[PDB]
Amino acid sequence: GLMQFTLPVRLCKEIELFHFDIGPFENMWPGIFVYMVHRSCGTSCFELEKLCRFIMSVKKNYRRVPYHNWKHAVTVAHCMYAILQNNHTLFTDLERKGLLIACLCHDLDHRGFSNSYLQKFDHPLAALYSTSTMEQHHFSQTVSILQLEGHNIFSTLSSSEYEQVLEIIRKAIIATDLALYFGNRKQLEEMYQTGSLNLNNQSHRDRVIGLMMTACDLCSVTKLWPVTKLTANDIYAEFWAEGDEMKKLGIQPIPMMDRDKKDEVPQGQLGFYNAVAIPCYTTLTQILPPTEPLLKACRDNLSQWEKVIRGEE
Ligand SMILES: CNC(=O)c1c(NC(=O)c2nc([C@H]3CCOC3)cnc2Nc2cncnc2)cnn1C
């Protein structure tokens, strides 16, 4: 009841900044998440006995892959924490509860392979879910863990609040399918410019929340250069493994996944910041001004990749 989580001074201060790195001590990440829920949401949001049991089952169902792992789950949750804390009054109690859990759960049981690789392999998950294949799987896994005895962290919500929160989480996790990001950002671009963007319109919040999820999910590109550069090696370790697996099916992989084309990475990162990340944080900053530090940190990392190419590192 009166039991807070308290982080050491440096973490208590840095955890409030968008660029915060959750560190290499795995056994602290659960407490960092609970700490975030308690300040975002309150000490009453969840029964600690149940939250703690939910967190540890979720951790168990993340796999030991280089990038799409338990660390990514918590990293992506912290970004959402930082967005919610810098936009105090724009989000409901249910939304604050729902979105931290969505971010923690958004890549459950990821194998380190794209939706494309599942379809070309003819994986069973691609027959069960034709689009947003891994993402429908991740939402599935979330509902499953929620229905383990003692894991229903939402049990104390009204029947209808319960249905709204599971719906916020479902849309939030589907929106992490980057294939849906491009059209969602376009629609939000037009809505903001023509002035029709309206946060009391539920289909509009949904789009805003979808963009927040892309922003949180890609937030490894908004860290200090040394974090971002070393995270890029983890993500390319997965891509290259998928490329190896493509070649075993007898298919030339796209360049971002071919470990023979490592030379082309610096330029591939430029295209990625320009075509995906910069646009994402630009449109997000326009809708939610206080999230501007994510855009500034992203531009700094683009500049660092520009320096890598010019020989300067
Ligand atoms: C759409 N174009 C791309 O995805 C893409 C890259 N992507 C990526 O490089 C990349 N992709 C993702 C998401 C989307 C696909 O996998 C998870 C996340 N972080 C990424 N980069 C990253 C860089 N540095 C730190 N953390 C993450 C690299 N080159 N291209 C062409």
Ligand SMILES: [Mg+2]
């Ligand atoms: Mg994902």
Ligand SMILES: [Zn+2]
């Ligand atoms: Zn993710």
